[PDB]
Structures are given as C-alpha cells and as structure tokens.
Amino acid sequence: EGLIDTAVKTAETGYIQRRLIKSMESVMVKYDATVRNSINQVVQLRYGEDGLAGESVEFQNLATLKPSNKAFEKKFRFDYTNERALRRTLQEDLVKDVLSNAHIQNELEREFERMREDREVLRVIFPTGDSKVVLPCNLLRMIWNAQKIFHINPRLPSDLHPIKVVEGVKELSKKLVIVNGDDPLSRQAQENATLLFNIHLRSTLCSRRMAEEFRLSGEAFDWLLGEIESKFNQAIAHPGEMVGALAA
Amino acid sequence: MIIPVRCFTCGKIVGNKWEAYLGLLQAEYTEGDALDALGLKRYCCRRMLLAHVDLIEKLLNYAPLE
Amino acid sequence: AGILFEDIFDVKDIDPEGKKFDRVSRLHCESESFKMDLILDVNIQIYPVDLGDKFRLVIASTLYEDGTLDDGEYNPTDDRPSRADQFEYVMYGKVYRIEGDETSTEAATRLSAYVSYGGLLMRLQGDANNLHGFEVDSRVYLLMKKLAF
Amino acid sequence: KRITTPYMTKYERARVLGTRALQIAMCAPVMVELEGETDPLLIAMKELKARKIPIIIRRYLPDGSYEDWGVDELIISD
Amino acid sequence: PYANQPTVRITELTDENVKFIIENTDLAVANSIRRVFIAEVPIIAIDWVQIDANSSVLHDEFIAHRLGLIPLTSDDIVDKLQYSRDCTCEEFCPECSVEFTLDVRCNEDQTRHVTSRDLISNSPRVIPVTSRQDDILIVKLRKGQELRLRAYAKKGFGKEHAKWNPTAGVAFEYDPDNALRHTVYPKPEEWPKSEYSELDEDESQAPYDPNGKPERFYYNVESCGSLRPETIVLSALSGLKKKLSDLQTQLSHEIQSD
Amino acid sequence: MNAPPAFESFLLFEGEKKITINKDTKVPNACLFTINKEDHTLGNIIKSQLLKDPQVLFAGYKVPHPLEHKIIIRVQTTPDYSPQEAFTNAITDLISELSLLEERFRVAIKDKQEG
Amino acid sequence: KFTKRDVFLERGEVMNLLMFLSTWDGKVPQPAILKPRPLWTGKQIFSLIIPGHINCIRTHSTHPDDEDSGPYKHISPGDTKVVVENGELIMGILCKKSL
Amino acid sequence: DDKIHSRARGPIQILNRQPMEGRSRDGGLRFGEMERDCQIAHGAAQFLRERLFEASDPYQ
Ligand SMILES: [Zn+2]
Ligand SMILES: [Zn+2]
Structure with missing residues (x-):
C-alpha cells in the first residue's frame, strides 16, 4: 500500500508542480516596488502586501496582544508618581526631570494612548489571540546583543531618559519607508504597509520596559536603532526578483 | 571458483589447506574439529573453508580436447 | 585579594532526583556560618565525595596572591605563585545570571549567583550581603578543598 | 526626481561585477591600484569595493520611463 | 624532556x-x-608475470593474481636486494630481482594440481614456502591444457599492495x-x-x-x-x-x- | 580508470619537498610543519614525543584529506625555545629510544633461544 | 553526545581537535578543571567553534515540560534549556532543535 | 566507470543541431524544463540564455 501511494504521488505531484509553475512564470517585482506580470497588470501594489523578501523574516511574538486590562496598564504606562521606583531604575539626574517637567508626562501619556490604540488595532486585526507573528527584525535578539556587548548589567540605574526613547522611536518610524513620496495617498499607503512592524516596535520599545527589563543606555539605544534600520533596509524585497517561480 | 590464496580479512595463507581440509573431513573428522586441527584460530579465516564453493570442477568438466 | 566569597560547607544530599549522568552529580550542600545554599556539580569520578564531608569553598577572581587579573589562557609554564597549591579541586567558569528577590521599591535581600564551569552549574543562593563581588559576565574560580576534620 | 530604491540589488551587483570582469579581461584600464593579483573578477570586486566602476545602471520603470543610477552614487549591499 | x-x-x-x-x-x-x-x-613477492601460453579455464589475469599472493621466503635476501624503482639498469637484473619459471602441461589422464612447487626459481634461497603441509594450489589443469610462463620477484611493502x-x-x-x-x-x-x-x-x-x-x-x-x-x-x-x-x-x- | 597508482603514497614527485616550514602569524613562536607522502605513522609518534616536552605549549597534527598524502604538524613552544630545535630533539630522542628498544628486543630473542 | 555535561577531555585530545578548526585564534582556552588534572569539557571546546558573539535560547529534545514552572529553571538537572551568550555554549545539549 | 560521462562540444544530431543523447553515443545531459524553472527562480537570466543558446545550438 505504501509503495503504491509513493508511486502515484511521484506521478501526480510532478504534474501539479508543472501547472503551478506555468501559471506564474512571468510575475516579478518591477523597480516601481510593485508586483506585475508580462502584461504589466498590477497584481499586488507591494510584494506580499508588505514588500519584504521572504528570507529575512523570523517568527516573533506580540507582547501587547492578548493581555489583561489590568496587566496591560502596569506594563506599558511608566508610572511617574512612585519616585522610589524611578530612583531604582533611572538615575538621580532624571527622576527630578521626569517629575517636575510636565511635558514629559504629557508625552508619556500620549505614548500610552497610542499603545492602547495599537492594541485595539491588533485585536480587531488578529482575532483568536495569535501572538506568533512573522516580522523582519527580531527586536528581542537585538536588545540582548546590545546588552551583551555594551555590558548593561541590569542591576544598576541606567542613564536613558524616556524622551530619548520616544524621539528615537518616532525618528525610526520615519526612516523606515516603503512607499516613497509625500503625497497624501503615498503617506497613507506607507502607514498601512509598515503598520504591524511599527506596532511591534512600539510595543517592545517603551518607557517602562526599557527601564525595567532592558536598562539600555544612550549609546546602546543608538546602536540598537542603527542596527534595526540597517536590518530593515536589507530586508526589503529586491526589485527584479522572480517571485512567481519562488511561490510555485 | 577456486580456493583463494590468502584470507581477505586476516591474510593467512589458506590456499594450501583446501585439500587437507577435504581429506580430514573425509577420514572421520567433522568441520568444527577439522578447522582447529588445521590451525585456524580466528573466525575470519574459517569462512574460506566453509563458505568457499568449488566450481572449478564443473569448469574442468568441459575439457577442450579428449 | 580578589576573594569574592569564602565559607565552609558540608554535603547533605547527592543527586536527589536520581543520578542522571555517570561522572557528574548534584551536591545540595549547605553552609555553616553564612547559611547559604549550594548546588555545586563536581566530577565525582576523579574527585569522589560522600555525604557529611566538609570543604572550604573559596570563589576567587584570580589564582594569584597579588591579584594581577590574568587574561585567561592555559599557560602551564608559569613559576608565579598560585592559590591552587592548597586545593584538591579547582575549576574555571563564568557567572551568567544573578537572580534575586528584588522589588520595585526596596532593594533585594537574597541573591542567587548562577555560574557555569563550562557545563558544570552551581547556584550560590543566600543573602545579598556577601555576594557583592559577583557581576554578570565575569570569570571566577572555585578553589575547594575537602576538610579532614 | 528618482524614486527607485537607493540600494544596489544583488542582481545588479552581480551583473556589474561580471561585465567589469569581462571588460578587464579584454585589456581595459583598471580603476584601482593592483596589489599583485591577476584574476579579472577579483579586480572587479576590488573596484566595486572602491566605488570606481565606470558604469551607470538604467532601471526601467513599468510605465516606460527610466532612471540612470551610477555605481558610485547608490549604496552597495555586499 | x-x-x-x-x-x-x-x-x-x-x-x-x-x-x-x-x-x-x-x-x-x-x-x-x-x-x-x-x-x-x-619483503620479496611476485610483481611481474609474463604469460606466454595459458590454455586453462580461468582468466589470463587470474594466474597473475594468484601468483602475486604466493609468499616467498626472504630471511637474508630482502636486505640485500634493492627496490626496482631505484635500480640503475634495464630489465629485471638478478641483483635487484629474482626470476621464476613455470611450465606444466597435463599429459596423463588424471587432472593436474599446479602447486607452488612448480615455481622453479633461479636463486636457491628465494623459494616458496615448501622447505619444511601441502603447497599453495595455483590452478587445476586437465588433459589437453597447459600453463607456461615466467615471472620476476621484487622488493616491496604492504603500503603498496597486500x-x-x-x-x-x-x-x-x-x-x-x-x-x-x-x-x-x-x-x-x-x-x-x-x-x-x-x-x-x-x-x-x-x-x-x-x-x-x-x-x-x-x-x-x-x-x-x-x-x-x-x-x-x-x-x-x-x-x-x-x-x-x-x-x-x-x-x-x-x-x-x- | 582514474584510480591513482600505489607508489604515490610514499614516493616523492619531482619538485615536491619532503618537509616545509611555515611560520604562523597569529601567535609568536608557532610554525606549521607540512610533510609530504606520509601518514599517521610518522606524525603520531612525533606528536606524543612533543607532548612529553614541557616547553612545548601546543602540539598536534592532522590530515587535510585522506586521499591526499599530506599532514600538517603545528608546534608552539615558549619564546625562549624555537620549535625547530623542539622538532629536532623529538626526532633525535625518538630515534635513540627506538634503537635501544631494538637492541633490548634482539638480546631478549637471542637469550630466549636455548636459555 | 559531545555536548553532554559528563564529557571531559585531556590536553592531548583538546590540542588534536583544535587542529581541525579553520578559525582558531591560536590561544588555548582555560580548562574547565585545572586540578587535580587539566580537563576540558565538550561545551567549552564547542564554544570556540561558534563564531562571533551569538545569543540564542533553545530547548532540548528530552526537556521535561514541568521544569520551567517549578524551581531549577536556570539550572537544569538534565542538562537542557540551551543557553548561548557571546557565542559560547553555557547550558543544554545540542540536538536538531538547535542545529 | 559505466556511468561516468562528460562532454565538450561532441557530435551533433542531423535534424535539430543539438548534442546527442546517451553515454555510448557521447551525448550531453538534458537541461530539463524544471532546471529552467529553477534558474528563473534564481533570476540568473544570463546563465539561462547561455545554457539554452550559447552551449546548445548557436545559429545566425
Ligand atoms: Zn581470516
Ligand atoms: Zn637491476
């Protein structure tokens, strides 16, 4: 029985593969960063609905997905009232700045509001609570490498103001571009495409987690941003790659 | 077809023992006794007298002339 | 000096969960003064040990008395004094995790140094006072000697 | 007003290296000091690393337009 | 040290x-x-066989193969002879080799047993193991067949061949x-x-x-x-x-x- | 059809050197001795003999490919003891030990016969 | 079997294995057990084979599930829970899950 | 020895000027359509055109 099954499979799968290959043999990614065919008919405005190569993508997890409302509040809010916790995490020359200054407090509140919005988007987009998702850059591995290189020693008060993290994330959210162009439609498409990756980046890089579990310093965070941007740039889908044959 | 000259594994000469082996088996001795009577300790050299097939006889049956 | 820790211990249980390997066993030892736990893993084959035996474990950052902070490399041809001359079992590893009972407000009171001697693990759990010399990603030794008593 | 990616794809890099190697093998002037090697492909790789290849790539767009990019203008991947 | x-x-x-x-x-x-x-x-052994007339049933190369495996005593000859590769002459000189000859033809009715004893060596001390126990059977001939050849022996070591x-x-x-x-x-x-x-x-x-x-x-x-x-x-x-x-x-x- | 002959395992070819010295650049006082047309017979004894010498910090050979008849021996001694003299001393004492072993075996044999 | 906890090698074997390393820096690592005799460990030798400063975590085939929840999480009696830091094997036994 | 085979501009057929087939006739291997699909997947158009035109049957 097994031998007969193998013989028929060896005869049927070849024809199946041939038909699959002869239907997408001309599809490719043109230099306009879009997938078309020999008739120049657009099949996808971006390869794989994102425009990224399939080689530089790894499984990851969404921390801000499927939490509890009470846990989500005590993990991404960065309470600025308990000065003892700040002294334990941040240095003395930052606790006073984060307390007295109200602009930092407003900025952190806005960050938490954006985080909540991203969590709602993920819930309405990823039903059934599936944390396992595929994204280009493994931020946890990068953070671990930064810790092991710069010798963070996550016991001492680190020197990294939350505003630095916020501005760094905002700039990295601008540098990573997929749909070039200042046109409103171009910006809308860029936001739509690079949406899940930005949500994951914000969820991993926060003001509380960065100062409790990672304790990265300014130089470490700058190196992390550089590494992330370089890896995302390398992860882009190279135009002129026959994706039809690869899919077949 | 014909008894080899040496054991493939060991190397001991076994070609000069086929006739003696047949004679000992014919007289009264058995195989398990004849093998160690000839001087074959290792089990690798004992296959040459047990596994060997004597096909040269059938070949000689087809005498060219007379 | 470089003595990161110094204390006498005693063996009280070996491989409680059943000896897994054949040359390594768990040594659930206890202290006598500082009251600290110990899960050292010694090579039972070359250095046999039975229950009730006491030994002087001394975690040192270097083997020299003057403390020159050796780079780390096997150089047997060396005439300099070595602290290993008075120990029957020495090892070399690198601590990789310092867990403790820390909180969000008040500092920790009990730490737990996790050091791996190239595969042989050891957890020096105890108070957070005598473990000040342990920092993640740092080379350390063992320097244990069985006491005849 | 070029909108193509500012990075050199692997296909373009390979083709440029091959073309420069072929040209060098046909007795063409080099654009870098030779440290004592003879393989034309190695010389082409050294020139690419030194960003001195006298070639400009014309990336055709689906509509019909094109953009001329120079090897010493865009960033090299490898 | x-x-x-x-x-x-x-x-x-x-x-x-x-x-x-x-x-x-x-x-x-x-x-x-x-x-x-x-x-x-x-050690000395057979490494160059010139077959002139082989009417046996086995292959032409089979005779050479079997002859190559026949041991030869070299208690005091191996140390004297030199490797044929390092010789400074032409043809297998006796100073650096030992000649053999075999000429057997089954004439009677019964079948012959061509053993190592038929290898007539020119040198006295370089002979197959038959001094002091049957002899190494080479091939079996029948009335009408023959086996004429002459071979030379040279010095070598196991690394070259068994x-x-x-x-x-x-x-x-x-x-x-x-x-x-x-x-x-x-x-x-x-x-x-x-x-x-x-x-x-x-x-x-x-x-x-x-x-x-x-x-x-x-x-x-x-x-x-x-x-x-x-x-x-x-x-x-x-x-x-x-x-x-x-x-x-x-x-x-x-x-x-x- | 492409099987190599049997003399290419021990016999030197015209132009090939029996031994070549090459100094290493990663650490001081370290040279790699490359031998041609040899096997483990002539490298394992030298490795062990070098191991005996305390002044030799490192000693070990290898076979780049079994079909290729070549072995590389890497030696690293103290800065006040070059590896060339280490190799020479290892060969010399090994030869002396083998000669002494041969003499002892010969006298033991001659005494064993009727004695 | 080379990366088990109960693997010990002598100076001769270690120096023989290092010869088969195309990226050795040329320095002998400090043995895991100096006295009573210099003995290396399989993991320590395998660390030199790992290039760069890699960091990853993997689980062994025979890893009991009821181990992370209870104590002995970072110190596994069965030598599981592969942990690599700075391109050096620290814990666990290598298998298909990691290689 | 009965399976090893090679080729370097060997004999050509008479109908379609392409290499022969079979080890005995000193022919070349077939570059099947699946190999063509694999090469397209690699995007190596130059290698594909070479294998299909330069070393197969050049003609003007
Ligand atoms: Zn045998
Ligand atoms: Zn001669």
Missing part, C-alpha cells in the same frame, strides 16, 4: 608467531610500530583490565576476561585509576611463512629508524637553507 626506557619480554617464541610485551612506552609508539608491522615491511604483507594478524592489546576506562562497558559482568587479564574471577573490571598511563602493550605478530616474526619486528624497527633519520636530515637541510 627526553625519551623513555622501554623494556621487552618474550612470552612465547616459535617459528610461526611471537608473543612479546613492551612496557614503559607511549601508546602512539606502540600503534605506529603495529602499523609498520602490517604496512612498511620490506602481496607484501608478511604479518597475518597482529593482536595488539593493552590494559586488559578496563582500568583507564578507555572503553565503558554498559554491563561489565556480561563480558569475558581477556587472555592477559590478571584480575580474579570475582571482580568484573579493575577500579578506576586517574593518574595512570597506558603501559604493558601485548603483541602477537603472526608470520605468514615468508619472514620470521622476530625478523619482521627487527625489520620494522630498522625501517622506522631509517624513516626518522631521513626526516631529520630533510628538516636539517630545510632549516639550513632558510
């Missing part, structure tokens, strides 16, 4: 094999000496009791005791020994019949010494040239 003082003791001396023991030596030297016993041992392999089987063994734990028995009780085991029948294996080097290497060199066992050992030692001397000379020349 020098060598050691090995000792030797023969336990059984016969004309077919020797069982000696080497003590106070490194394992590498012992294993090298073994591999030299098997591979690098000068024909120059004097030793039948070397029984190399050290540390009979598993004291150095070089092998871990899952169930020691299920294994038999080695021939050289001094341990009693109660204990299965000797206890562990941390500070212990391998010594007391046992040997059972078994001669095929061509070269004597002790002669094989002496030739192997001389050849290894010559190889080391040549390597030392080459190294000295290389250092001086630099």
Whole structure:
C-alpha cells in the first residue's frame, strides 16, 4: 500500500508542480516596488502586501496582544508618581526631570494612548489571540546583543531618559519607508504597509520596559536603532526578483 | 571458483589447506574439529573453508580436447 | 585579594532526583556560618565525595596572591605563585545570571549567583550581603578543598 | 526626481561585477591600484569595493520611463 | 624532556608467531610500530608475470593474481636486494630481482594440481614456502591444457599492495583490565576476561585509576611463512629508524637553507 | 580508470619537498610543519614525543584529506625555545629510544633461544 | 553526545581537535578543571567553534515540560534549556532543535 | 566507470543541431524544463540564455 501511494504521488505531484509553475512564470517585482506580470497588470501594489523578501523574516511574538486590562496598564504606562521606583531604575539626574517637567508626562501619556490604540488595532486585526507573528527584525535578539556587548548589567540605574526613547522611536518610524513620496495617498499607503512592524516596535520599545527589563543606555539605544534600520533596509524585497517561480 | 590464496580479512595463507581440509573431513573428522586441527584460530579465516564453493570442477568438466 | 566569597560547607544530599549522568552529580550542600545554599556539580569520578564531608569553598577572581587579573589562557609554564597549591579541586567558569528577590521599591535581600564551569552549574543562593563581588559576565574560580576534620 | 530604491540589488551587483570582469579581461584600464593579483573578477570586486566602476545602471520603470543610477552614487549591499 | 626506557619480554617464541610485551612506552609508539608491522615491511613477492601460453579455464589475469599472493621466503635476501624503482639498469637484473619459471602441461589422464612447487626459481634461497603441509594450489589443469610462463620477484611493502604483507594478524592489546576506562562497558559482568587479564574471577573490571598511563602493550605478530616474526619486528624497527633519520636530515637541510 | 597508482603514497614527485616550514602569524613562536607522502605513522609518534616536552605549549597534527598524502604538524613552544630545535630533539630522542628498544628486543630473542 | 555535561577531555585530545578548526585564534582556552588534572569539557571546546558573539535560547529534545514552572529553571538537572551568550555554549545539549 | 560521462562540444544530431543523447553515443545531459524553472527562480537570466543558446545550438 505504501509503495503504491509513493508511486502515484511521484506521478501526480510532478504534474501539479508543472501547472503551478506555468501559471506564474512571468510575475516579478518591477523597480516601481510593485508586483506585475508580462502584461504589466498590477497584481499586488507591494510584494506580499508588505514588500519584504521572504528570507529575512523570523517568527516573533506580540507582547501587547492578548493581555489583561489590568496587566496591560502596569506594563506599558511608566508610572511617574512612585519616585522610589524611578530612583531604582533611572538615575538621580532624571527622576527630578521626569517629575517636575510636565511635558514629559504629557508625552508619556500620549505614548500610552497610542499603545492602547495599537492594541485595539491588533485585536480587531488578529482575532483568536495569535501572538506568533512573522516580522523582519527580531527586536528581542537585538536588545540582548546590545546588552551583551555594551555590558548593561541590569542591576544598576541606567542613564536613558524616556524622551530619548520616544524621539528615537518616532525618528525610526520615519526612516523606515516603503512607499516613497509625500503625497497624501503615498503617506497613507506607507502607514498601512509598515503598520504591524511599527506596532511591534512600539510595543517592545517603551518607557517602562526599557527601564525595567532592558536598562539600555544612550549609546546602546543608538546602536540598537542603527542596527534595526540597517536590518530593515536589507530586508526589503529586491526589485527584479522572480517571485512567481519562488511561490510555485 | 577456486580456493583463494590468502584470507581477505586476516591474510593467512589458506590456499594450501583446501585439500587437507577435504581429506580430514573425509577420514572421520567433522568441520568444527577439522578447522582447529588445521590451525585456524580466528573466525575470519574459517569462512574460506566453509563458505568457499568449488566450481572449478564443473569448469574442468568441459575439457577442450579428449 | 580578589576573594569574592569564602565559607565552609558540608554535603547533605547527592543527586536527589536520581543520578542522571555517570561522572557528574548534584551536591545540595549547605553552609555553616553564612547559611547559604549550594548546588555545586563536581566530577565525582576523579574527585569522589560522600555525604557529611566538609570543604572550604573559596570563589576567587584570580589564582594569584597579588591579584594581577590574568587574561585567561592555559599557560602551564608559569613559576608565579598560585592559590591552587592548597586545593584538591579547582575549576574555571563564568557567572551568567544573578537572580534575586528584588522589588520595585526596596532593594533585594537574597541573591542567587548562577555560574557555569563550562557545563558544570552551581547556584550560590543566600543573602545579598556577601555576594557583592559577583557581576554578570565575569570569570571566577572555585578553589575547594575537602576538610579532614 | 528618482524614486527607485537607493540600494544596489544583488542582481545588479552581480551583473556589474561580471561585465567589469569581462571588460578587464579584454585589456581595459583598471580603476584601482593592483596589489599583485591577476584574476579579472577579483579586480572587479576590488573596484566595486572602491566605488570606481565606470558604469551607470538604467532601471526601467513599468510605465516606460527610466532612471540612470551610477555605481558610485547608490549604496552597495555586499 | 627526553625519551623513555622501554623494556621487552618474550612470552612465547616459535617459528610461526611471537608473543612479546613492551612496557614503559607511549601508546602512539606502540600503534605506529603495529602499523609498520602490517604496512612498511620490506619483503620479496611476485610483481611481474609474463604469460606466454595459458590454455586453462580461468582468466589470463587470474594466474597473475594468484601468483602475486604466493609468499616467498626472504630471511637474508630482502636486505640485500634493492627496490626496482631505484635500480640503475634495464630489465629485471638478478641483483635487484629474482626470476621464476613455470611450465606444466597435463599429459596423463588424471587432472593436474599446479602447486607452488612448480615455481622453479633461479636463486636457491628465494623459494616458496615448501622447505619444511601441502603447497599453495595455483590452478587445476586437465588433459589437453597447459600453463607456461615466467615471472620476476621484487622488493616491496604492504603500503603498496597486500602481496607484501608478511604479518597475518597482529593482536595488539593493552590494559586488559578496563582500568583507564578507555572503553565503558554498559554491563561489565556480561563480558569475558581477556587472555592477559590478571584480575580474579570475582571482580568484573579493575577500579578506576586517574593518574595512570597506558603501559604493558601485548603483541602477537603472526608470520605468514615468508619472514620470521622476530625478523619482521627487527625489520620494522630498522625501517622506522631509517624513516626518522631521513626526516631529520630533510628538516636539517630545510632549516639550513632558510 | 582514474584510480591513482600505489607508489604515490610514499614516493616523492619531482619538485615536491619532503618537509616545509611555515611560520604562523597569529601567535609568536608557532610554525606549521607540512610533510609530504606520509601518514599517521610518522606524525603520531612525533606528536606524543612533543607532548612529553614541557616547553612545548601546543602540539598536534592532522590530515587535510585522506586521499591526499599530506599532514600538517603545528608546534608552539615558549619564546625562549624555537620549535625547530623542539622538532629536532623529538626526532633525535625518538630515534635513540627506538634503537635501544631494538637492541633490548634482539638480546631478549637471542637469550630466549636455548636459555 | 559531545555536548553532554559528563564529557571531559585531556590536553592531548583538546590540542588534536583544535587542529581541525579553520578559525582558531591560536590561544588555548582555560580548562574547565585545572586540578587535580587539566580537563576540558565538550561545551567549552564547542564554544570556540561558534563564531562571533551569538545569543540564542533553545530547548532540548528530552526537556521535561514541568521544569520551567517549578524551581531549577536556570539550572537544569538534565542538562537542557540551551543557553548561548557571546557565542559560547553555557547550558543544554545540542540536538536538531538547535542545529 | 559505466556511468561516468562528460562532454565538450561532441557530435551533433542531423535534424535539430543539438548534442546527442546517451553515454555510448557521447551525448550531453538534458537541461530539463524544471532546471529552467529553477534558474528563473534564481533570476540568473544570463546563465539561462547561455545554457539554452550559447552551449546548445548557436545559429545566425
Ligand atoms: Zn581470516
Ligand atoms: Zn637491476
């Protein structure tokens, strides 16, 4: 029985593969960063609905997905009232700045509001609570490498103001571009495409987690941003790659 | 077809023992006794007298002339 | 000096969960003064040990008395004094995790140094006072000697 | 007003290296000091690393337009 | 920072094999000496057969193959002859080879048994193992067939071909009791005791020994019949010494040239 | 059809050197001795003999490919003891030990016969 | 079997294995057990084979699930829970899950 | 020895000027359509055109 099954499979799968290959043999990614065919008919405005190569993508997890409302509040809010916790995490020359200054407090509140919005988007987009998702850059591995290189020693008060993290994330959210162009439609498409990756980046890089579990310093965070941007740039889908044959 | 000259594994000469082996088996001795009577300790050299097939006889049956 | 820790211990249980390997066993030892736990893993084959035996474990950052902070490399041809001359079992590893009972407000009171001697693990759990010399990603030794008593 | 990616794809890099190697093998002037090697492909790789290849790539767009990019203008991947 | 003082003791001396023991030596030297016993041992053998008329039933090359495996005694001839490759003449000179001849033709009615005894050698001492026990059967001829040829013998070693392999089987063994734990028995009780085991029948294996080097290497060199066992050992030692001397000379020349 | 002959395992070819010295650049006082047309017979004994010498910090050989007849021996001694003299001393003492072993075996044999 | 906790090698074996390393820096690592005799460990030798400063975590085939929840999480009796830091093997036994 | 085979501009057929087939006739291997699909997947158009035109049957 097994031998007969193998013989028929060896005869049927070849024809199946041939038909699959002869239907997408001309599809490719043109230099306009879009997938078309020999008739120049657009099949996808971006390869794989994102425009990224399939080689530089790894499984990851969404921390801000499927939490509890009470846990989500005590993990991404960065309470600025308990000065003892700040002294334990941040240095003395930052606790006073984060307390007295109200602009930092407003900025952190806005960050938490954006985080909540991203969590709602993920819930309405990823039903059934599936944390396992595929994204280009493994931020946890990068953070671990930064810790092991710069010798963070996550016991001492680190020197990294939350505003630095916020501005760094905002700039990295601008540098990573997929749909070039200042046109409103171009910006809308860029936001739509690079949406899940930005949500994951914000969820991993926060003001509380960065100062409790990672304790990265300014130089470490700058190196992390550089590494992330370089890896995302390398992860882009190279135009002129026959994706039809690869899919077949 | 014909008894080899040496054991493939060991190397001991076994070609000069086929006739003696047949004679000992014919007289009264058995195989398990004849093998160690000839001087074959290792089990690798004992296959040459047990596994060997004597096909040269059938070949000689087809005498060219007379 | 470089003595990161110094204390006498005693063996009280070996491989409680059943000896897994054949040359390594768990040594659930206890202290006598500082009251600290110990899960050292010694090579039972070359250095046999039975229950009730006491030994002087001394975690040192270097083997020299003057403390020159050796780079780390096997150089047997060396005439300099070595602290290993008075120990029957020495090892070399690198601590990789310092867990403790820390909180969000008040500092920790009990730490737990996790050091791996190239595969042989050891957890020096105890108070957070005598473990000040342990920092993640740092080379350390063992320097244990069985006491005849 | 070029909108193509500012990075050199692997296909373009390979083709440029091959073309420069072929040209060098046909007795063409080099654009870098030779440290004592003879393989034309190695010389082409050294020139690419030194960003001195006298070639400009014309990336055709689906509509019909094109953009001329120079090897010493865009960033090299490898 | 020098060598050691090995000792030797023969336990059984016969004309077919020797069982000696080497003590106070490194394992590498012992294993090298073994591999030299098997591979690098000068010995004479058949390596050039000129067949003029072979009417037997076997192949033309079969005769040459069988003749190549016939041992030849070289107790005092191997050390005198030189390798044919390094000869300074043409044709197989007797000074660097030994000639053989075989001319048998079955005339009577009964079938012939062409044995090694038919190999008429020109030299007296270079003869197949038939001095002092049947002879190596080459082929069987019948009335009407014949086998005429002449072959030459040359010096060679096992590394080139198995024909120059004097030793039948070397029984190399050290540390009979598993004291150095070089092998871990899952169930020691299920294994038999080695021939050289001094341990009693109660204990299965000797206890562990941390500070212990391998010594007391046992040997059972078994001669095929061509070269004597002790002669094989002496030739192997001389050849290894010559190889080391040549390597030392080459190294000295290389250092001086630099 | 492409099987190599049997003399290419021990016989030197015209132009090939029996031994070549090459100094290493990663650490001081370290040279790699490359031998041509040899096997483990002539490298394992030298490795062990070098191991005996305490002034040799590192010693070990290898076979780049079994079909190729070549072995590389890497030696690293103390800065006040070059590896060339280490190799020479290892060969010399090994030869002396083998000669002594041969003499002892010969006298033992001659005494064993009727004695 | 080379990366088990109960693997010990002598200076001769270690120096013989290092010869088969196309990226060795030329320095002998400090043995895991200096006295009573210099003995290396399989994991320590395998660390030199790992290039760069890699960091990853993997689980062994025979890893009991009821181990992370209870104590002995970072110190596994069965030598599981592969942990690599700075391109050096620290814990666990390598298998298909990691290689 | 009965399976080893090689080729370097060997004999050509008469109908379609392409290499022969079979070890005995000293022919070249077939570059099947699946190999063509694999090469397209690699995007190596130059290698594909070479294998299909330069070393297969050049003609003007
Ligand atoms: Zn046998
Ligand atoms: Zn001659």
